[PDB]
Amino acid sequence: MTFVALYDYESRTETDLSFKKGERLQIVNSTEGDWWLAHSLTTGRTGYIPSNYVAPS
Amino acid sequence: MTFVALYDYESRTETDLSFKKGERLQIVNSTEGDWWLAHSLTTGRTGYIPSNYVAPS
C-alpha cells in the first residue's frame, strides 16, 4: 500500500527512484516481483534479481 | 538461502544479475533491503526503492 520515506535516497541507476525524507510512496505491482541481491553459485557473478524468476531449491 | 532460476533473465542495468534457467543463486544481505517498484505521490516519479528506507504510513 502506502509508505513514507525515512531517509533521502539518491538514485544510482536509470531505474531507481530518488526521493526525499517524508515523501509518500505507493508500491506498484509488476510481474517481476521484488528484487533481491543475489550471488550466483553457478557463475560467481552478483547483482539484483527479480524474485518471481526463482524458487527455493 | 539458496534458490534456483526458473527462467533465463538478461540484465537491463549495470546492477542487475543476468542468469540462465537452472542456475543456483544465494541471497546476499545488504543494508538497503529488498527493492520494490514504487510510485511517489509526492513527485509523480516511479522506480525502484530500497525497502529499508521506508515505513508503512
PDB file of C-alpha atoms in Angstrom:
ATOM      1  CA  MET A   1       0.000   0.000   0.000  1.00  0.00           C
ATOM      2  CA  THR A   2       1.342   3.441   1.072  1.00  0.00           C
ATOM      3  CA  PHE A   3       4.737   4.109   2.696  1.00  0.00           C
ATOM      4  CA  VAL A   4       6.700   7.100   3.888  1.00  0.00           C
ATOM      5  CA  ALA A   5      10.392   7.672   3.281  1.00  0.00           C
ATOM      6  CA  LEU A   6      12.562   7.701   6.409  1.00  0.00           C
ATOM      7  CA  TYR A   7      15.675   8.999   4.619  1.00  0.00           C
ATOM      8  CA  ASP A   8      16.725  10.796   1.482  1.00  0.00           C
ATOM      9  CA  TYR A   9      17.797   8.397  -1.285  1.00  0.00           C
ATOM     10  CA  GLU A  10      19.750   9.414  -4.374  1.00  0.00           C
ATOM     11  CA  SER A  11      19.341   7.230  -7.467  1.00  0.00           C
ATOM     12  CA  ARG A  12      22.354   5.256  -8.702  1.00  0.00           C
ATOM     13  CA  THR A  13      20.998   3.799 -11.924  1.00  0.00           C
ATOM     14  CA  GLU A  14      18.466   4.691 -14.592  1.00  0.00           C
ATOM     15  CA  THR A  15      15.802   2.541 -12.901  1.00  0.00           C
ATOM     16  CA  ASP A  16      15.856   3.551  -9.253  1.00  0.00           C
ATOM     17  CA  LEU A  17      13.680   6.286  -7.780  1.00  0.00           C
ATOM     18  CA  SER A  18      15.254   9.255  -5.976  1.00  0.00           C
ATOM     19  CA  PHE A  19      13.239  10.572  -3.045  1.00  0.00           C
ATOM     20  CA  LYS A  20      13.443  12.813  -0.001  1.00  0.00           C
ATOM     21  CA  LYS A  21      12.684  12.027   3.600  1.00  0.00           C
ATOM     22  CA  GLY A  22       8.973  12.476   4.124  1.00  0.00           C
ATOM     23  CA  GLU A  23       7.754  11.505   0.672  1.00  0.00           C
ATOM     24  CA  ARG A  24       4.683   9.315   0.335  1.00  0.00           C
ATOM     25  CA  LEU A  25       5.261   6.279  -1.815  1.00  0.00           C
ATOM     26  CA  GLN A  26       2.929   3.702  -3.258  1.00  0.00           C
ATOM     27  CA  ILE A  27       4.026   0.208  -4.145  1.00  0.00           C
ATOM     28  CA  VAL A  28       3.486  -0.680  -7.752  1.00  0.00           C
ATOM     29  CA  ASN A  29       2.831  -4.215  -8.898  1.00  0.00           C
ATOM     30  CA  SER A  30       4.954  -5.665 -11.688  1.00  0.00           C
ATOM     31  CA  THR A  31       5.312  -9.185 -12.992  1.00  0.00           C
ATOM     32  CA  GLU A  32       8.996  -9.325 -11.989  1.00  0.00           C
ATOM     33  CA  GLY A  33       8.257  -9.101  -8.229  1.00  0.00           C
ATOM     34  CA  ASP A  34      10.530  -7.593  -5.526  1.00  0.00           C
ATOM     35  CA  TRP A  35      14.193  -7.588  -6.342  1.00  0.00           C
ATOM     36  CA  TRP A  36      16.803  -9.320  -4.257  1.00  0.00           C
ATOM     37  CA  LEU A  37      20.578  -9.034  -4.147  1.00  0.00           C
ATOM     38  CA  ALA A  38      21.861 -12.466  -5.159  1.00  0.00           C
ATOM     39  CA  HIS A  39      25.100 -14.303  -5.780  1.00  0.00           C
ATOM     40  CA  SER A  40      25.250 -16.996  -8.426  1.00  0.00           C
ATOM     41  CA  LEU A  41      26.943 -20.132  -7.246  1.00  0.00           C
ATOM     42  CA  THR A  42      26.920 -21.176 -10.828  1.00  0.00           C
ATOM     43  CA  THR A  43      28.746 -18.212 -12.433  1.00  0.00           C
ATOM     44  CA  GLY A  44      30.179 -16.284  -9.448  1.00  0.00           C
ATOM     45  CA  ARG A  45      28.513 -13.024 -10.553  1.00  0.00           C
ATOM     46  CA  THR A  46      26.456 -10.933  -8.133  1.00  0.00           C
ATOM     47  CA  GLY A  47      23.656  -8.418  -8.573  1.00  0.00           C
ATOM     48  CA  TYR A  48      19.923  -7.853  -8.256  1.00  0.00           C
ATOM     49  CA  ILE A  49      17.425 -10.424  -9.490  1.00  0.00           C
ATOM     50  CA  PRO A  50      13.636 -10.416  -9.963  1.00  0.00           C
ATOM     51  CA  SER A  51      12.337 -12.659  -7.282  1.00  0.00           C
ATOM     52  CA  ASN A  52       9.469 -14.077  -9.360  1.00  0.00           C
ATOM     53  CA  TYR A  53      12.098 -15.727 -11.613  1.00  0.00           C
ATOM     54  CA  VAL A  54      13.332 -18.071  -8.932  1.00  0.00           C
ATOM     55  CA  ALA A  55      12.165 -20.686  -6.451  1.00  0.00           C
ATOM     56  CA  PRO A  56      13.641 -22.249  -3.280  1.00  0.00           C
ATOM     57  CA  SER A  57      15.972 -25.174  -4.019  1.00  0.00           C
TER      58      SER A  57
ATOM     59  CA  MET B   1      19.071 -19.097   1.477  1.00  0.00           C
ATOM     60  CA  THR B   2      19.519 -20.927  -1.876  1.00  0.00           C
ATOM     61  CA  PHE B   3      17.246 -20.585  -4.930  1.00  0.00           C
ATOM     62  CA  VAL B   4      17.109 -21.932  -8.449  1.00  0.00           C
ATOM     63  CA  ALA B   5      16.318 -19.893 -11.539  1.00  0.00           C
ATOM     64  CA  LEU B   6      13.105 -20.860 -13.338  1.00  0.00           C
ATOM     65  CA  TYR B   7      13.814 -18.718 -16.418  1.00  0.00           C
ATOM     66  CA  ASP B   8      16.645 -17.022 -18.228  1.00  0.00           C
ATOM     67  CA  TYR B   9      16.994 -13.343 -17.271  1.00  0.00           C
ATOM     68  CA  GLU B  10      19.004 -10.793 -19.233  1.00  0.00           C
ATOM     69  CA  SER B  11      20.325  -7.788 -17.302  1.00  0.00           C
ATOM     70  CA  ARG B  12      18.948  -4.341 -18.152  1.00  0.00           C
ATOM     71  CA  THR B  13      21.142  -2.130 -15.999  1.00  0.00           C
ATOM     72  CA  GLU B  14      24.648  -2.146 -14.570  1.00  0.00           C
ATOM     73  CA  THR B  15      23.378  -3.537 -11.249  1.00  0.00           C
ATOM     74  CA  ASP B  16      21.178  -6.479 -12.161  1.00  0.00           C
ATOM     75  CA  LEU B  17      22.427 -10.048 -12.453  1.00  0.00           C
ATOM     76  CA  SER B  18      21.987 -11.996 -15.702  1.00  0.00           C
ATOM     77  CA  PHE B  19      21.343 -15.706 -15.246  1.00  0.00           C
ATOM     78  CA  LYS B  20      20.174 -18.816 -17.059  1.00  0.00           C
ATOM     79  CA  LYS B  21      17.406 -21.205 -16.166  1.00  0.00           C
ATOM     80  CA  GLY B  22      18.803 -23.737 -13.741  1.00  0.00           C
ATOM     81  CA  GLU B  23      21.365 -21.558 -12.000  1.00  0.00           C
ATOM     82  CA  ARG B  24      21.750 -21.785  -8.239  1.00  0.00           C
ATOM     83  CA  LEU B  25      21.513 -18.442  -6.524  1.00  0.00           C
ATOM     84  CA  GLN B  26      22.206 -17.340  -2.994  1.00  0.00           C
ATOM     85  CA  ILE B  27      20.575 -14.327  -1.426  1.00  0.00           C
ATOM     86  CA  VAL B  28      23.012 -11.732  -0.237  1.00  0.00           C
ATOM     87  CA  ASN B  29      22.283  -9.442   2.674  1.00  0.00           C
ATOM     88  CA  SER B  30      22.707  -5.700   2.218  1.00  0.00           C
ATOM     89  CA  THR B  31      21.679  -2.782   4.375  1.00  0.00           C
ATOM     90  CA  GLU B  32      19.323  -1.447   1.680  1.00  0.00           C
ATOM     91  CA  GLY B  33      16.959  -4.464   1.875  1.00  0.00           C
ATOM     92  CA  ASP B  34      14.794  -5.875  -0.966  1.00  0.00           C
ATOM     93  CA  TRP B  35      13.873  -3.412  -3.644  1.00  0.00           C
ATOM     94  CA  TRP B  36      10.328  -2.522  -4.537  1.00  0.00           C
ATOM     95  CA  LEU B  37       8.820  -0.768  -7.535  1.00  0.00           C
ATOM     96  CA  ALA B  38       7.235   2.393  -6.140  1.00  0.00           C
ATOM     97  CA  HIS B  39       5.380   5.476  -7.284  1.00  0.00           C
ATOM     98  CA  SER B  40       5.870   8.744  -5.452  1.00  0.00           C
ATOM     99  CA  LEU B  41       2.643  10.500  -4.678  1.00  0.00           C
ATOM    100  CA  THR B  42       4.764  13.433  -3.769  1.00  0.00           C
ATOM    101  CA  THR B  43       6.747  13.897  -7.017  1.00  0.00           C
ATOM    102  CA  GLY B  44       4.943  11.636  -9.531  1.00  0.00           C
ATOM    103  CA  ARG B  45       8.168   9.778 -10.412  1.00  0.00           C
ATOM    104  CA  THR B  46       8.327   5.979 -10.413  1.00  0.00           C
ATOM    105  CA  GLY B  47      11.141   3.477  -9.992  1.00  0.00           C
ATOM    106  CA  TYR B  48      12.761   1.010  -7.616  1.00  0.00           C
ATOM    107  CA  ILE B  49      13.373   1.883  -3.977  1.00  0.00           C
ATOM    108  CA  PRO B  50      15.310   0.208  -1.145  1.00  0.00           C
ATOM    109  CA  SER B  51      12.687  -1.079   1.172  1.00  0.00           C
ATOM    110  CA  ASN B  52      14.684  -0.445   4.360  1.00  0.00           C
ATOM    111  CA  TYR B  53      14.393   3.309   3.634  1.00  0.00           C
ATOM    112  CA  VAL B  54      10.660   3.403   4.138  1.00  0.00           C
ATOM    113  CA  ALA B  55       7.934   2.515   6.616  1.00  0.00           C
ATOM    114  CA  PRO B  56       4.146   1.996   6.394  1.00  0.00           C
ATOM    115  CA  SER B  57       2.187   5.256   6.658  1.00  0.00           C
TER     116      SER B  57
END
